[PDB]
Structures are given as structure tokens and as C-alpha cells.
Amino acid sequence: ILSTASVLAFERKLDPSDALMSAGAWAQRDASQEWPAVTVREKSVRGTISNRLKTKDRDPAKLDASIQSPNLQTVDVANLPSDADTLKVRFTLRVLGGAGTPSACNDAAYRDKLLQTVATYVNDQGFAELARRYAHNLANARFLWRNRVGAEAVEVRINHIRQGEVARAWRFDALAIGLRDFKADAELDALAELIASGLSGSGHVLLEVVAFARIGDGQEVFPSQELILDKGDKKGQKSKTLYSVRDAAAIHSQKIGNALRTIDTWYPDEDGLGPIAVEPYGSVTSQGKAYRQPKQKLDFYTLLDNWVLRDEAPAVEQQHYVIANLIRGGVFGEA
Amino acid sequence: LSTASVLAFERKLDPSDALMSAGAWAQRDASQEWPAVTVREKSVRGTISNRLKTKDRDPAKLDASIQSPNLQTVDVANLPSDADTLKVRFTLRVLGGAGTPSACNDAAYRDKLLQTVATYVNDQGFAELARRYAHNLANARFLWRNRVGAEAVEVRINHIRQGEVARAWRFDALAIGLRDFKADAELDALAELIASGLSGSGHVLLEVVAFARIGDGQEVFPSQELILGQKSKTLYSVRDAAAIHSQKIGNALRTIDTWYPDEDGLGPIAVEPYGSVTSQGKAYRQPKQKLDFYTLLDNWVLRDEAPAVEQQHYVIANLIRGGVFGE
Amino acid sequence: MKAAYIIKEVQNINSEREGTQIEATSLSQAKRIASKEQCFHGTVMRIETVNGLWLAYKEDGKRWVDCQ
Questions:
Q1: B28, B48, B49: best mutation site toward chain A, by most A Cβ within 10 Å?
Q2: Burial, B152: exposed, middle or buried (Cβ in 10 Å; 0-12, 13-18, 19+)?
């Protein structure tokens, strides 16, 4: 008995908004509400097709006649203004709670055994490790993806807004706090015990997150890119589109949040490759592989089917991976 | 004597579409000029997240499928970066004449059905049903996922005389629970207005406005369309405002059923024949037991075997939502 | 009959680059001789008429996407 429920769907906890980019001077960070938006512009590039060569002809005249024709193109680019050296990135985060309750299910016995399994997690140890692990990915500005690379300073400023007004504030040197180790601070444990109170359904948690990244006058900033359809389909012009909201350059709200759940430091075949994002069959597109295979027995499906059905409770570090997938949300049914 | 092969009831409690707009809280008494929430697109790169069907366990295909993923376009609705409040506004029309079918095929079955519904109304009114519908207007259950994790939800209901406001009501939708039915001296008035509308005394038109502090730039959830960088999600919009379907607002009004032949440890469900919820995937009023709508209707109309007083509210509540009944 | 086409090898779909004129009977013959005469890997082939109207394109190991 006790087959898996053929429908499982969980709503996401930790939902961030799109983050909007602005620009100003680093000594004006305390009055940065009226900083103008980074705009997306256009420019023309041309370059040589210098990709790797198909092995048919080694004759010099072929490559010499190919490089005489250049490649003309129009891209979208985002830069700081030439008098501004600081990028501002601002978003709001909301941490919901009620993590183990599915949004859709079929079996009622599977749903009650799942709720009691997640309750027996939460009562033994709370959300303390996961919230300390999320507060580090807020405290360092990992959500600044390529904007973080090569900055003189990165500042992170976090406000808890219990009304319109701000209940408590935080300021972090985001480069002192590393990108690998989860070392402890008092002011970071305060933010962790706020995120764990939000995840345990205790209070309402809305966080305003502002990150200042000094990169230099006029330098290129990096928003997220859009797909090319409906921007020239039969004869088009633009071949690179950047994400805007109201012609303010922006990062998608799922590329943030991907950076928040970069939690998983428990996956077998590694020594020092760092934390990865929490995913079922824990995988990375850049390395092009799944760090958490089903030929081994460490996936979210293979852990959860033993922790609910057969009641084989895994090692307590895998009980953070499973609860992190349930805070992530998703469609975990047979299809 | 027997059930007519053609029955049709019309719906009472007509809601409209609910249009979504955004502004700032404490600008709520001047929220007539708020900008609408616009549905826009964004690109999505996804990852392999679903269960594999045990012939795709191999690394040689899982690595090739995680190497080149799929790219989608979704429709998304957000608040603006300076607006924290979602305003949702629709009108409700409460008709009355609840037991009369619109299409019928018998004269004796129709006469005995009207006799039975008149017996129901003359014993106790529409007051118990209207209390449970007024409670679903007071809490903002018609805000479906727009209500969970909201800092404050406030509901305002105006009753409209000609174009003028006769009575205005004001409710805190989070203090008024979502899984009870209590009493209050200002919700009794809304319940008896809806009762005087369903019994046929007055003309009742309501204007329902709900506010919800979701947060600056956060995602709001309009109702979703069916799909006719291929697009994965399409949101409902009337002209350019994001909107909610009228039947999903209407669904959240007749979630009043607390009389099950199953366990009452799950809250109210929506009034349906064979009382069912898709999100739990089971029907709580089975025809194995004798408490679905059709068996109770046949026993109460044809052979004069009345159900219990609480199940009569269920049968009348199925007559209020309308439907194509009859064998 | 032998019709004239313009075979182009560009970086991505919305790039402009001066192409090479072929002589082909059908569009399938142009797709065959545009399968070869491609020097690089991560490039997009495009088949056009002599006046600049697109006919088909192919993006780094996919189907020929015809242009209606």
C-alpha cells in the first residue's frame, strides 16, 4: 500500500520581486530614493566570425575571403552614466510560511503522513539552519550576479517593514561576508531568526533589500536577457534584448531567488565546488551535469519517498535539502 | 410525480469580472483613479524538475537534457515598484426567485418543486444561507492567492440604490476568519440585505472593493487562460487591466458547505453536486451514501421524504447556483 | 531552370552579413549546398533571394525553419 500521490504541487515560499537598477554616487547612498534608472540603449557591433572551423578546407584563400565580410548586428546595452559609479539594485522579498502544506494532492493519507513528517522535522529542529543559510545569500549580494564581479565595495542594506514604516534595519559589507562559507554574526543571526519566524508561520515578513555595487564611471551593468520572439520574426533588426519594466533595467525575479536558494552544500561527488541551488536532481546548467543523480540515492524524490512512505528518515543534512525543495515549490507529481 | 427530463435553474448571485488596480495604502479613500495592473511578458529558462519514468534514469540522457534546457514566455502581473496595495473591485447582483426553474418539462413536478421550495422558505427564510454568503464577502475569499501572506486585507461593500450608496460596510478580512461562521452586528445587516434580495423583496446590487497590502512590486495573481519560446502561461485581461474571471469570484462565494457525510476537519467547500474539490481530488458527497444533491432532491420533492434541516440548506444552495438538472 | 539564391552564414538570426550567390534548381538543393559551404560551428545559415527576402534558416544543428 501507500503509493505516491499522483498530483503534488507546492506554492513557493520566499517570493522576490523583479529588482530594478539605478545609478548614482557612492557618497550619496543614504539619499538614493531619487536616483535615476539605468536605461537600456542600443548600439551597433561588428566583428569577425572567429568560431571554430569545420575541417573541410585548410586553404588560406577560403578563410581570407570569409573574414573580408564582417558580421553586422544591433544589441541592447546597459551602462552607468559617466558621472555615476555606483549601481543600486532594489527588490522586496516576502517569506510566507506553511511550507509543507501542498497546494494540490490526491491521497489524503499521503497528505497527512507528509504533513506529520514535515511537522516532525520542524519540531525537532526548526528552520534555523535553512534560515541562516538564506540570510547569507541575502547578506552577500549573490543576487548581484555579474554585477558583483570586480567591485571596490558591495553594500547590502535590508529593512523589515512591519507597516509602511521600517521595523528594523541591517547593513552588511557583502564582500567581507564570503561567497563560500556560512560564518556567523550576531546581526546576521537576527536576520536569520526573522526569516525562520516568517517560515514557521509566526509573523508577517516583508523585507526590502537594497544593494549598492561601486563599479566605476560609465561601466557596463548586466540585467537579464529576453527571448528574441516578437522582436523581429521574419525580417528583424535587434539580436539581443534586455529586460526592462518601465525602461528601467531589471533582473528577472527568478534569477533572484535562484541566488537565494543556492544552499545545497550536501551533495556527494565533490570536495570544494561550493554551494549550488536547491533543485530536484540537483543540477547546474553551466557545468551541464546533475550533481545529485538517481543512479545514486540522494535525490529529492528518492529521499522523500523514503522519508514519507517507508519512514526511513535520512541524515539530518538531507532533511534540509528536502525541506528546501518544499520551500522552493514545484510540480512533484507523476507525469 | 416523477422527475422531469428537462430542468434548468438560473444562477442567482451574479458577479462580474473583478478588475485589479494598484496604489498606495492610506490613499484608499481616493482610490477611484488608481492605475490598473497590466499583464506583461518575461522570459523563463526552466530546469528538469519533474519525475523521470524509470527509463530516463541514465546519466547520458539526464546530462543532455540539463545541458540544453527549454525557454518559455510567461505572462506575469506585478504591482508597480512604489505601489504596495492591490485593489480588486467587482459588482454583485442578487436576484431572487430561487426555486423557480427556467426550463421545465412537467407541470406536476414543477408545481410540487415550487410547493417544496415555498415550504422551505416559509419554514425558515434565506437567512442561514445569506449569513454564509455575507461571510464570504466579509472575508476576502474571492482574493484567492492574492490573500495568502497579505499584511492587511480590507473589504468595503456599498449597496447601490440608483447610483447612490444606501449603506456602506467596512470589514477587516483577516480578523474575520476563513474557516468559521460567527455573528456580528454589522455583518447581520449585510446578511439580511442578501436575504431580502434572495427572497425577492428588494432589488439588491452590491459593489465590493477589496484592498490587500501585498508589498512593493510583488506578484499579483489574475485568473489564467487556457493555451490555444512558446508561451507557457496566459493571464486574463479585460481591456488592459488584469482581471479575475467571474466564475472564480462566484466560486468563492458559495464555499459555504459545512455539512459533510465525511470528516469536518477540512473547512468549508464549495456547493457542488457530489461535493467536490479538484485541489484535493475527491468528492465528499458520494452517492454511495445518501447525501449528494440528486438523491436528496429526489427524496425531498418526489416521495416527500425530507432531509435534515441542515441538508435542506445544501439543496437550496444548489438551486441558487443553477444548473442543468433533470433526467 | 537554375535559380539564384544568396547563402549567408551569420552569428545569430538577426545579423546582417554579405553572402555568396549560388545557382540551384530547388530550395532543397539550396539547403543541401548550404548544409555544406559552412565554415564555422556556432553559426546560422540563411537562404535568401537576390533582392533580400528570407526563405529559410538553420541554427546550429536544428531543422531548417522555413520563412512563410
A1: B49
A2: middle
